[PDB]
Design an enzyme around this catalytic site. Structure first.
Site, short mmCIF file in Angstrom:
data_model
loop_
_atom_site.label_atom_id
_atom_site.label_comp_id
_atom_site.label_asym_id
_atom_site.label_seq_id
_atom_site.Cartn_x
_atom_site.Cartn_y
_atom_site.Cartn_z
N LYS A 196 3.98 -0.41 0.36
CA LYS A 196 4.60 -1.01 -0.82
C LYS A 196 4.02 -2.39 -1.06
O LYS A 196 4.64 -3.41 -0.73
CB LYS A 196 6.12 -1.07 -0.65
CG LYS A 196 6.90 -1.20 -1.94
CD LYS A 196 8.39 -1.14 -1.67
CE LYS A 196 9.19 -1.66 -2.85
NZ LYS A 196 10.56 -1.09 -2.89
N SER A 209 7.07 -4.28 -9.09
CA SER A 209 7.02 -4.96 -10.38
C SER A 209 6.65 -6.42 -10.19
O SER A 209 5.71 -6.92 -10.82
CB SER A 209 8.35 -4.82 -11.10
OG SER A 209 8.51 -5.81 -12.10
N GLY A 210 7.38 -7.12 -9.32
CA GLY A 210 7.05 -8.48 -8.93
C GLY A 210 7.22 -9.52 -10.02
O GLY A 210 6.33 -10.33 -10.25
N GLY A 211 8.37 -9.50 -10.70
CA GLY A 211 8.62 -10.45 -11.76
C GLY A 211 7.86 -10.21 -13.04
O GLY A 211 7.85 -11.08 -13.91
N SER A 225 7.19 1.78 -7.51
CA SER A 225 8.53 1.55 -6.97
C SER A 225 9.08 0.32 -7.66
O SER A 225 8.95 -0.80 -7.16
CB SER A 225 8.50 1.37 -5.45
OG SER A 225 9.68 0.74 -5.01
N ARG A 237 22.61 -10.56 -11.77
CA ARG A 237 22.25 -9.66 -12.86
C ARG A 237 23.45 -9.28 -13.72
O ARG A 237 23.30 -9.11 -14.94
CB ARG A 237 21.58 -8.40 -12.30
CG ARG A 237 20.06 -8.47 -12.28
CD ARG A 237 19.46 -7.39 -11.39
NE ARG A 237 18.12 -7.74 -10.91
CZ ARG A 237 17.87 -8.58 -9.91
NH1 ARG A 237 18.86 -9.16 -9.24
NH2 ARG A 237 16.62 -8.83 -9.55
N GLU A 277 6.57 -3.03 3.17
CA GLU A 277 6.47 -3.86 1.98
C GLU A 277 6.12 -5.30 2.36
O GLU A 277 7.01 -6.12 2.64
CB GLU A 277 7.76 -3.82 1.16
CG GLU A 277 7.66 -4.54 -0.17
CD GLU A 277 8.99 -5.08 -0.64
OE1 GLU A 277 9.01 -5.98 -1.50
OE2 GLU A 277 10.02 -4.57 -0.16
N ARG A 315 13.28 -3.85 -11.16
CA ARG A 315 13.70 -4.43 -12.43
C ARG A 315 13.02 -3.74 -13.61
O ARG A 315 13.65 -3.53 -14.66
CB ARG A 315 13.41 -5.93 -12.44
CG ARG A 315 13.75 -6.65 -13.73
CD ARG A 315 13.19 -8.07 -13.71
NE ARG A 315 13.24 -8.70 -15.03
CZ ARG A 315 12.29 -8.58 -15.95
NH1 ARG A 315 11.21 -7.86 -15.70
NH2 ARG A 315 12.42 -9.19 -17.12
#
EC number: 4.1.2.13
Lengths: 343, 343, 343, 343
Positions: free
Chosen positions: B228, B270-272, B299, B41, B186, B302
């Site tokens: 999660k 979010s998951g991409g 939660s 990142r 999660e 990104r």
């Protein structure tokens, strides 16, 4: 890979039936007593066991006053009672459907001993269940019932008993949901023995968790089923006394940790309780200050009809009086469905 | 026989922490990026990887304006970030606890390949977890996080992968709950591949059912845990387009069939996804006309900090501007927690 | 805690029967063809289906020459054939027991479709099995048979099918062992489709492992049971050709990795094979240079009687000739039990 | 679908190592005592705990006479003992490999308490096991060891303990078999308490069945593993006395009902037994008149070296005498591997 067990129309009709049964304020009358159990019940009153006596008793139960119409949404019948007719000429499924009820049928074939265990039983009746369920669907039955027995003892229930009963219940529910019949899953835990609220709550959580895991394994449409548990209550020989708020808190806590909210309704047992304490405990359960995302209602076999069977006495001329007693209990249990009951 | 894993005081403090985290309107910032992921990142922005750069970036994240105080109820940190101090002198757990946050820590040790499978991984980090959790509890961490990876493929996920990940998650949650730390379970399902909503919903239901069965097997206090999951979304290479209402309906339907209502909150990934579509989908999930008996919140790793990382650029003088972008997203996601969001 | 399912006398009689069945050099004739299957078989020869024709065909099978006495140790019969008598006056169980055979009975009620799967079936017939098994034990039946069907496909067999069939087989074996009847566990894997030796071996190992885990869960006395698997063979549409040594190595390797040596014997299927290749493959299996700590024998339905059914033609005067063909196959299969066979 | 965990060359080398370890007449010396256990053992003799004392004691164990060369086929070492050198200059793996031994290493990280149970423990040490196993494979270790603890009590072992220990053992065996290291599965059942042969046999059968089901779930190559069980023996506080033939019959009967014959060898524990009764019981086990299709040998920690540790006394000049005692026991146990032992 996903192969759907049900089309969306089947899911819609199963959800419609399951929502019609546990509608707010409504409950289930369990008139499914087989010939041996109703023989003991008619022997307690002191009358002989004949087809006419059983037909007249179920006439007293099913042809009551119109005040039970927003009280009873579903009626569980025997196999014999589906084909018996009232003296007016209407068969009993038509008598149930005429005043807003849903016709059910008890479809299991009893209990079998499990080998190697300490008096643990499994349930019988899986053979021919698809043809029988299609036949009952033709005759007006829209839901079913299956009863598994589990007892608390020294080391019972074992993993074998809970595993076998959960697998048999899931197989039953799959076969019933293939034919458009809402299954009612009943993992009854026996109140026999001496055990406190904590052990009964522990066994209830373990049994219900294995039951819902087996229901997830067998691709059961959970929105078109009903749950029939027993209230979390101490044993018969338990010396400690518990308030109704503690029993209600233990029941709602054991239900909230396991039961997913897609299940449409929860119909409690009487389970050897008295006629008034069952409605008191159900009113306490519906007054618990937790968030309960399903229908909490009653499915009472003995706790609806014990006073009517006592006030009947086997004499026809007592009929209305006996019916009035039944109507009273039904009205009380309707308020026990809504939390608005007070004795 | 029942031996209690937790005393009622431990249950009370775990329920208090778990209710403080997913409080209505609040969410979780995931600043738990390890050195490789945050190295990629910081390479995307074009700055070197140094302890001072990571400390300054987490200073930008954690020392924002006071408008995020009813936005972020919990912050997940790395192991390194627990022992780093701000330039004012306060260590980062004190910076989080000063404005009403709860300090968390990512405690897993990565993913290990499972032998015999088609690219399926399990999660690492069970050794020394009791001593590490007691140490983090001394340093201000009140909750934890553990990440399992499952991908949808030709015949994946198999029974072995879901069984192993559910067992490892339950063992993790038991070890964390022994030390007074709320575990966040999660089971991330990867959105890679081409698969429609129905298969992702099917895999989500199976994985969550095996997860909650393993949690019931390990005597986990479900009122003191968090869930999660990922949103039920189509794959990246899936050609069919779905509205946000269909994604929200699939997510709430997959959650309602499995998750018992004793679980305190559900914090989505979010998951991409993009920065705005995650808040749009969360607002759609909180606007679904079903009965959802738990906290639906965010939660986001990104999707909270991508705009702030872009507007930062690695330059100190841009700071407030970058922080302002972050604050904007936080405010938006707070409305996405309440259903009151509109773009 | 251990509650014994069987007394040592029951274990002794079950082990005695199970050792009498799979005695060295002996095998099982499967004359258990129901009315539909034997109707198709009598339609192939071109004769009508009548009780007298089936009784005469089973007369041809059961009243053969005395050279099959150290060939056939057990005979599986239908429910109808138990109550049919020979023209000499002896009922068929007495004809079997007179020359050293053991009487069996096929006790399942067919296959039921499993909902949600891709053409996977479970087996029916658990109700009333204790009373039926006591009745058959009174009529001379000392062992039983139960047939489960599993097919290899794209993603089949799933975990649900293998789990359900293993649980039903273990429940069957428990009910049969309670009544003094040796159960024969038959997890038949269908050779339909195109799949190599490796996938059939993989599915055989997984199915047999789940079967023996379910047998361990249900407290089955493994010394008083028999195993009835299919030979590890490629599919019907598989283009690759395999020698008989490779088929035998795959079968013995799939058996040695799963089956505990307390199981008394292994009785292989024909499974749609030819009449000679079944004996060739069994001779190859008994000639494998591995250590095989159980009885390897035959239980052939079609591969014993196909030549006799062809040489019969539905005409009585052909009888001895047809019987002679049957005797030939029996003799060959006896050598296939001992590894001393050569064509 | 089948994705092979191992290539045929990996299967060949694992089978070659596993056949070299449990070769007929050979056994395993367990010199894997950690610093606390060997600290208690050196405190019992009355010497201080130093690296030089432990190095000298393992010098006494490993550099014995050449008569133990067809006695010991494998030696389990600590992590520290792999990097310690003898005074001649050879490191201890080279001392083991010079006279025909196979180097092993104890790789677990101790026991962790399981929450909610009655004193039940799981085993630790899964993190970094692939890198550690590759490092030990570079340093000469060809097999490993992992120890799970299960105790018999009132309601222990529960399903949770056996399930968790079997899953952890299968995960360990998968990680070890990926790196070319033969795993030794050790489900030790504690002889503490008062329980007869029947309950210990019952618990041994249940634990071994769940262990081998978990090994089948994780695609373990069973031909390249070893089994390390405890002998089926009564408890320490059990008042009933049993002959060695009854103990041997219970052990061979509990092994034959579960263990598939693809497993290469069975290496028994001492398990708190005396030095002579362990060899007597192993000679009785190898003299049982049943068919045992695997290697029955010894893996004795205390029962090989207790007399040598006593005759050592912490003095160097006693060395040969102490070594001679060890050699005696080794010779005896070799005959206990072959059934040719007599006291």
């Amino acid at each position: 890979h996903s192969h759907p067990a049900l089309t969306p129309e089947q899911k819609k009709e199963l959800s419609d039936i399951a929502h019609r049964i546990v509608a707010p304020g409504k409950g289930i009358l369990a008139a499914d007593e087989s010939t041996g159990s109703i023989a003991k019940r008619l022997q307690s009153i002191g009358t002989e066991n004949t087809e006419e006596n059983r037909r007249f008793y179920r006439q007293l139960l099913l042809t009551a006053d119109d005040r039970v119409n927003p009280c009873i949404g579903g009626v569980i019948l025997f196999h014999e009672t589906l084909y018996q007719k009232a003296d007016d000429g209407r068969p009993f499924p038509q008598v149930i459907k005429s005043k807003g009820g849903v016709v059910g049928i008890k479809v299991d074939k009893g209990v079998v001993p499990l080998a190697g265990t300490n008096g643990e039983t499994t349930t019988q009746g899986l053979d021919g269940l698809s043809e029988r369920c299609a036949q009952y669907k033709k005759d007006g039955a829209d839901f079913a019932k299956w009863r598994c027995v589990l007892k608390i003892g020294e080391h019972t229930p074992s993993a074998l008993a809970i595993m076998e009963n959960a697998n048999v219940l899931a197989r039953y529910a799959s076969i019933c949901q293939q034919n458009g019949i809402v299954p009612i899953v009943e993992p009854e835990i026996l109140p026999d023995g001496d055990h406190d609220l904590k052990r009964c709550q522990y066994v209830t959580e373990k049994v219900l968790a294995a039951v819902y895991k087996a229901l997830s394994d067998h691709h059961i449409y959970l929105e078109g089923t009903l749950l029939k548990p027993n209230m979390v209550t101490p044993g018969h020989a338990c010396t400690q006394k518990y308030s109704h708020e503690e029993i209600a808190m233990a029941t709602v806590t054991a239900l909230r940790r396991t039961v997913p909210p897609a299940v449409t309704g929860v119909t409690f047992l009487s389970g050897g309780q008295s006629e008034e304490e069952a409605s008191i405990n159900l009113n306490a359960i519906n007054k618990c200050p937790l968030l309960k995302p399903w229908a909490l209602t009653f499915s009472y076999g003995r706790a609806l009809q014990a006073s009517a069977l006592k006030a009947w006495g086997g004499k026809k001329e007592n009929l209305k009086a006996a019916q009035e007693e039944y109507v009273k209990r039904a009205l009380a249990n309707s308020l026990a469905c809504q939390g608005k009951y007070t004795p």
